[PDB]
Amino acid sequence: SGISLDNSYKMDYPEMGLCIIINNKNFHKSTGMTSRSGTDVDAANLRETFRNLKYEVRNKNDLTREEIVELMRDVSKEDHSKRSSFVCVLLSHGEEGIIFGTNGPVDLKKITNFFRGDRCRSLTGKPKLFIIQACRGTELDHKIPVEADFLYAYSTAPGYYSWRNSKDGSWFIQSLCAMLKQYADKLEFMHILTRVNRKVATEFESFSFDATFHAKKQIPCILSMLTKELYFYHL
């Protein structure tokens, strides 16, 4: 045949892949963590958005740290050979490097390690996307590498709080779903996420009766170890 290029991930496998949404709203009283009002709006928006991208969506609600680890282990041991990609969305409390189960924390590295190129062979060479709505602190504003082909779409910069509106959902997830709905059939994923960065940074500002938390801004951040362009469509 003619000249062939290979700069984009193959996204025409029989299945787009799994989209696992972990939606933690209510936390065990002994942890002292507040309920995350608005997170159901986020989870419903994500389910619809990724359904329209033809992902097989699984929604999980209020998982303990042990259930989160078992879920991720089990999913990583499925046969993904017919799937183009893998998506995991985490909606919870967090700190830098940490997501909360309902009864305590989970290292993000523990979750993502299950999908390393050497530990999930049916996803080797395929994009693994982790979308994280959670705080990252308390500031206010041997052929391929085993860490290759991961993308972390973080709601907020390292060290910073992340903002959630109790009526409308989180700023980041609202914006992410809007930009995927508008541009997934047109733009490469990094360009979509750049538009999410701009939407969050320009269209949102906190309102609080507490001067410490009032009039604050947010910038998300994209951490890419991808090796190819990612388009959700194919020719």
Partner: peptide, 4 residues
């Protein structure tokens, strides 16, 4: 508006 709330923080996570």
């Amino acid at each position: 508006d709330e923080v996570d």
